[PDB]
Design a binder for this molecule. Sequence first.
Ligand SMILES: *[C@@H]1O[C@H](CO)[C@@H](O[C@@H]2O[C@H](CO)[C@@H](O[C@@H]3O[C@H](CO)[C@@H](O)[C@H](O)[C@@H]3O)[C@H](O)[C@H]2NC(C)=O)[C@H](O)[C@H]1NC(C)=O
Lengths: 48, 49, 49, 48
Amino acid sequence: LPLFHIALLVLFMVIIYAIIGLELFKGKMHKTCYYIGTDIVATVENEK
Amino acid sequence: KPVFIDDANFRRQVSYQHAAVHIPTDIYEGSTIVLNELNWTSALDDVFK
Amino acid sequence: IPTINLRKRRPNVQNPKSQEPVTLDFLDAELENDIKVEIRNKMIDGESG
Amino acid sequence: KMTEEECRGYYYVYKDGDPTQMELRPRQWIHNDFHFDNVLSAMMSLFT
Ligand SMILES: *[C@@H]1O[C@H](CO)[C@@H](O[C@@H]2O[C@H](CO)[C@@H](O[C@@H]3O[C@H](CO)[C@@H](O)[C@H](O)[C@@H]3O)[C@H](O)[C@H]2NC(C)=O)[C@H](O)[C@H]1NC(C)=O
């Protein structure tokens, strides 16, 4: 019960940054490197 | 280092003084198992000739 | 019918080329008859004629 | 190749699990960066 005022504050802090983050970075991360004329993603050896 | 005359009946440069050796790629040469073939198999170059 | 997918060959890896034997048959090197399958069977079992 | 005397030469790596697309890489007897090999070494690992 004492922790309730905290766990209500964590929820209203994820909802701000979920909204803000969404507005700032929505749809941006859909352009990775690709080999020309192919669908193989082109990364280096230990890179994700 | 061999000397490699060019030839007919082979359409490539060749040496008639010894035999070449093909080791496959994922096989290491210098392994005792491989090193010991190149020892005993070396007596074929006289019968080859 | 040869089908290769260009969308999935990364450019510099070198797949295997070929190793198959060139097994053309006598009834496929020439137009087939019934009077040639007689000739062809008759000289698989080592006869003269 | 289970020991150092074997782990010499080249071996083929295969990219994205495709057996038709391979590259040669030299093979070496690597040693882990955090190991238990003297006590000082063991302690660093424990700290991590
Ligand atoms: C496999 O490799 C070994 C090592 O090179 C070869 O053994 C060597 O064979 C030659 C001729 O058979 C030996 O030469 C002889 O040396 C003695 C003195 O040691 C001399 O008295 C002879 O007149 C002759 O010069 C050579 O010494 C020998 N090496 C050893 C360490 O024994 C062997 O011939 C190779 N096998 C094949 C099939 O080629």
